Each structure stands twice: as C-alpha cells, then as structure tokens.
Design a protein around this motif. Structure first.
Motif, PDB file in Angstrom:
ATOM      1  N   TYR A  89      -8.228  11.106  -2.264  1.00 19.80           N
ATOM      2  CA  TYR A  89      -8.887  11.777  -1.146  1.00 19.80           C
ATOM      3  C   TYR A  89      -8.618  13.270  -1.243  1.00 19.80           C
ATOM      4  O   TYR A  89      -7.480  13.670  -1.472  1.00 19.80           O
ATOM      5  CB  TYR A  89      -8.345  11.268   0.189  1.00 19.80           C
ATOM      6  N   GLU A 138       3.639   7.469   2.644  1.00 17.42           N
ATOM      7  CA  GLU A 138       3.641   6.344   3.580  1.00 17.42           C
ATOM      8  C   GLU A 138       3.497   5.049   2.770  1.00 17.42           C
ATOM      9  O   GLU A 138       2.540   4.904   2.010  1.00 17.42           O
ATOM     10  CB  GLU A 138       2.467   6.450   4.577  1.00 17.42           C
ATOM     11  N   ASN A 140       0.755   5.504  -0.047  1.00 11.85           N
ATOM     12  CA  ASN A 140      -0.107   6.631   0.327  1.00 11.85           C
ATOM     13  C   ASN A 140       0.725   7.906   0.166  1.00 11.85           C
ATOM     14  O   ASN A 140       1.573   8.197   1.006  1.00 11.85           O
ATOM     15  CB  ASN A 140      -0.614   6.430   1.770  1.00 11.85           C
ATOM     16  N   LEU A 186       4.725  13.799   0.748  1.00 13.50           N
ATOM     17  CA  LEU A 186       4.909  12.839   1.831  1.00 13.50           C
ATOM     18  C   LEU A 186       4.284  11.510   1.440  1.00 13.50           C
ATOM     19  O   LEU A 186       3.091  11.465   1.139  1.00 13.50           O
ATOM     20  CB  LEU A 186       4.268  13.376   3.112  1.00 13.50           C
ATOM     21  N   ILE A 191      -3.898   6.922  -2.895  1.00 14.54           N
ATOM     22  CA  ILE A 191      -3.591   5.607  -2.359  1.00 14.54           C
ATOM     23  C   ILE A 191      -3.507   4.613  -3.510  1.00 14.54           C
ATOM     24  O   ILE A 191      -4.394   4.569  -4.351  1.00 14.54           O
ATOM     25  CB  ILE A 191      -4.681   5.099  -1.383  1.00 14.54           C
ATOM     26  N   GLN A 215      -4.561  13.437  -1.838  1.00 17.73           N
ATOM     27  CA  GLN A 215      -3.927  12.246  -1.312  1.00 17.73           C
ATOM     28  C   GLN A 215      -4.298  11.069  -2.199  1.00 17.73           C
ATOM     29  O   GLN A 215      -5.481  10.821  -2.415  1.00 17.73           O
ATOM     30  CB  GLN A 215      -4.426  12.066   0.110  1.00 17.73           C
ATOM     31  N   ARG A 268       0.839  -1.191   0.000  1.00 17.56           N
ATOM     32  CA  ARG A 268       0.000   0.000   0.000  1.00 17.56           C
ATOM     33  C   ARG A 268       0.876   1.244   0.000  1.00 17.56           C
ATOM     34  O   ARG A 268       1.659   1.440   0.923  1.00 17.56           O
ATOM     35  CB  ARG A 268      -0.902  -0.020   1.233  1.00 17.56           C
ATOM     36  N   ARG A 292       8.676   5.894   5.269  1.00 13.83           N
ATOM     37  CA  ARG A 292       8.278   7.293   5.125  1.00 13.83           C
ATOM     38  C   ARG A 292       9.245   7.901   4.119  1.00 13.83           C
ATOM     39  O   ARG A 292      10.463   7.767   4.278  1.00 13.83           O
ATOM     40  CB  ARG A 292       8.373   8.062   6.452  1.00 13.83           C
TER      41      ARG A 292
END
Ligand SMILES: *[C@@H]1O[C@H](CO)[C@@H](O[C@@H]2O[C@H](CO)[C@@H](O[C@@H]3O[C@H](CO)[C@@H](O)[C@H](O)[C@@H]3O)[C@H](O)[C@H]2NC(C)=O)[C@H](O)[C@H]1NC(C)=O
Length: 164
Positions: free
Chosen positions: A100, A25, A8, A23, A82, A80, A6, A35
């Motif tokens: 998102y 994740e 993000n 950024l 994913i 954002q 995953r 990160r």
C-alpha cells in the motif's frame, strides 16, 4: 479450526527522507496480537527475540524499498506491506503479499502461485514497476525467497497455535 496469521509493517518518509524505524501490527486469527517497532515488541517473562530479529530485518528492507520509489519529496508518504497466510479447515493453504502506498493498494503477489496483480491506474502502475524492479534487481529476490516467505509464515502460525 481455520486459522490465519497477518503481518502489517509500515515505514514513512518526510520530504523524501525515509524515517528511522518501523511499525508492525501482527494479527492471529483476526485478533490484534503484537505491536513491534525498532525498540521492542509488546503484546495486546515475555520475550519476543525471534520477532524482533525478523521484523527489524523486514523493516530495513522496506525502508530501502520506499527510498527507491521515484515519486516526490513533498510531505508525508507511507509504504506499507501486508503478509498473510491461512490454514483452512481442509488443511489447504492461502498466502499473499500486498503493498500500500499512502493507503492505496498498488501491488499484490499470491505466494501459493507466485503471480503478481498489477493495479489499474498508470500512477499506481509506475509504483508497482518501481517496487518490482527493486525486489528483483536490488534485493535480488527469487522464486525460492517467496516460497520461503510462505513457509516461514505458516511455520510461525503453527508455532503460535502450538503454545496459545
Ligand atoms: C496497518 O496498520 C496500521 C497501523 O499500524 C493501520 O493504520 C491505522 O488504522 C486506521 C486506518 O488506517 C487509522 O485510524 C483511523 O483514521 C484516522 C487517521 O487519519 C484516525 O484519526 C481515526 O481515529 C480512524 O480510526 C489509524 O490512525 C492508522 N494508524 C497509522 C499509524 O497509520 C492500517 O489500517 C493497517 N493497514 C492494513 C492494510 O491493514
């Protein structure tokens, strides 16, 4: 034996101005794994040259995607993305892409079938159409791009599992 990868990635804008950097994740089998930002990647002789290259490029894309959103230039906003891929126990796969805006899911694509899911509210529908237009027209993304997105994710998942 079932596994998942995953990604993000988040980009921000302030008074309509898209901020520098990003950024990311990353999660491996549900566990926080990396990160990453503009500077470097750090886990949660360590070299992450593949991830730094690929995530920086995605960061650049998503920043331009946020700039193309005809919303408002008042305060903080976040876009954002994913990206998920799964290898199931029976060797079958699932894979998807999700956007998102300010914490609210407004657009998804199933990367197995290349079908998009649009949101309920007209406000979210406006955002979805904006982004889908950007991806199709400005970014020039095609079926092959999204097939390739699935494959890259799966290949990375297999790479990480092969090592540890
Ligand atoms: C994608 O990753 C970001 C981080 O890179 C996730 O956002 C982070 O996670 C939570 C929930 O959004 C935030 O913490 C919680 O909310 C408030 C923040 O207003 C915090 O004060 C509380 O302590 C609480 O734990 C965290 O601040 C937030 N970080 C950032 C930089 O936004 C996000 O949830 C992930 N999104 C998805 C869809 O997985």
């Amino acid at each position: 034996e079932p596994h998942s990868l995953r990604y993000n990635l988040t980009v921000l804008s302030w008074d309509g101005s898209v901020q520098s950097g990003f950024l990311t994740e990353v999660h491996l089998d549900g566990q926080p794994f990396l990160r990453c930002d503009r500077q470097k990647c750090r886990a949660k002789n360590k070299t992450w040259d593949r991830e730094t290259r690929d995530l920086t490029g995605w960061g650049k894309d998503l920043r331009m995607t946020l700039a193309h959103i005809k919303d408002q230039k008042e305060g903080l906003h976040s876009l954002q993305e994913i990206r998920v891929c799964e290898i199931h126990e029976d060797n079958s796969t699932r894979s998807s892409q999700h956007f998102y805006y300010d914490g609210e899911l407004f657009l998804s694509q199933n990367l197995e079938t290349l079908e998009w899911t649009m949101p309920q509210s007209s406000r979210a529908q406006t955002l979805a159409m904006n982004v889908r237009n950007f991806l199709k027209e400005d970014a020039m993304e095609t079926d092959t791009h999204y097939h390739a997105m699935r494959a890259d994710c799966l290949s990375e998942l297999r790479r990480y599992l092969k090592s540890g």
